A paper describes a structure:
During cell division, these autolysins are responsible for splitting the equatorial septum between two dividing daughter cells. The highly similar AtlA and AtlE proteins consist of a signal peptide, a pro-peptide, a catalytic domain with N-acetylmuramyl-L-alanine amidase activity, three repeats (R1-R3), and a C-terminal catalytic domain with N-acetylglucosaminidase activity. The catalytic domain, referred to as AmiE in S. epidermidis and AmiA in S. aureus, cleaves the amide bond between the lactyl moiety of N-acetylmuramic acid (MurNAc) and L-alanine in the PGN structure.
To provide a structural basis of autolysis function in S. epidermidis, we crystallized the catalytically active AmiE domain and solved its structure at 1.7 Å resolution. The AmiE protein adopts a globular, mixed α/β fold, with a six-stranded, central β-sheet surrounded by seven α-helices. The rear of the β-sheet packs against helices α4 and α7 and is shielded from solvent, while its front forms the bottom of a recessed area that is largely exposed and solvent-accessible. The recessed area, measuring about 28 Å by 10 Å, is walled off by helices α2, α3, α5, and several loops. Located at the center of the recessed area is a zinc ion that is held in place with contacts to side chains of residues H60 (β2), H165 (α5) and D179 (α5-α6 loop). The tetrahedral coordination sphere of zinc is completed by a water molecule, an arrangement often seen in the active sites of zinc-dependent metalloenzymes. The conserved residues delineate a groove that runs along the recessed area, extending from the zinc ion to both the top and the bottom of the domain. The shape of the groove and its high degree of conservation indicate that it is the site of interaction with the PGN substrate. Moreover, the presence of zinc at the center of the groove suggests that AmiE functions as a zinc-dependent amidase. Residues E119 and H177, which are near the zinc ion but do not contact it, are likely to be involved in catalysis by facilitating a water-mediated nucleophilic attack at the peptide bond and stabilizing the transition state, as shown in Figure 3B. A DALI analysis shows that the closest structural homolog of AmiE is the N-terminal domain of PlyL, a prophage endolysin encoded by the Bacillus anthracis genome (Z-score = 18.4, rmsd = 2.1).
Residue numbers in the entry: 7 to 213
Amino acid sequence: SSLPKYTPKVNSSINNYIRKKNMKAPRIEEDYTSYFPKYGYRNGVGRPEGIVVHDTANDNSTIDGEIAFMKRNYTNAFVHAFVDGNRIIETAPTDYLSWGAGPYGNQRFINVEIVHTHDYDSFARSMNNYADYAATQLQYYNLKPDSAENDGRGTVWTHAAISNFLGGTDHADPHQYLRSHNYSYAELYDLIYEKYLIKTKQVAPWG
Ligand SMILES: [Zn+2]
Ligand SMILES: [Zn+2]
Ligand SMILES: [Zn+2]
Ligand SMILES: [Zn+2]
Ligand SMILES: [Zn+2]
Ligand SMILES: [Zn+2]
Ligand SMILES: [Zn+2]
């Protein structure tokens, strides 16, 4: 195409594998629940400020199990979306907040969960799927990707970054989870950034 290829800012054999395989994220599915609460973000309904990277609390759950448990326990916690190696499922409308990152995170950011995977390919697909969903939301909300990890400013936040800069929570996901699969947030962010650039037609698509 007329567009330049993205130059990766982070060395990543897993990202290389994703790009070379030309992985295609699945369609975003809606699975909403009538009794979930619908409250605006701190700047209003329809005004999220960014997106949070979570991994699921359990290492052995399925996306279906996670969702069923959440519907039963929504007064304790619920999130906007789950991704695994096969599916992207939005469980609450992104124009309203969700209950996944403590009081301060919840007022600002879309909460997205990475379901755990147990093989190389499934893990790589789940990373592609998270990154694709995140880039889609940033594009839809006219937000630009900016990692908050080191200075507490921007639109892409790990739960760890929320804990560090905002408080109201102490979870450090997804760092240890990604490390256990020989990956990292730095690599995930580089993938989000590239996918955002592809979607906004600034760099060439894969193929
Ligand atoms: Zn709908
Ligand atoms: Zn979390
Ligand atoms: Zn495991
Ligand atoms: Zn949506
Ligand atoms: Zn495993
Ligand atoms: Zn920045
Ligand atoms: Zn957690």
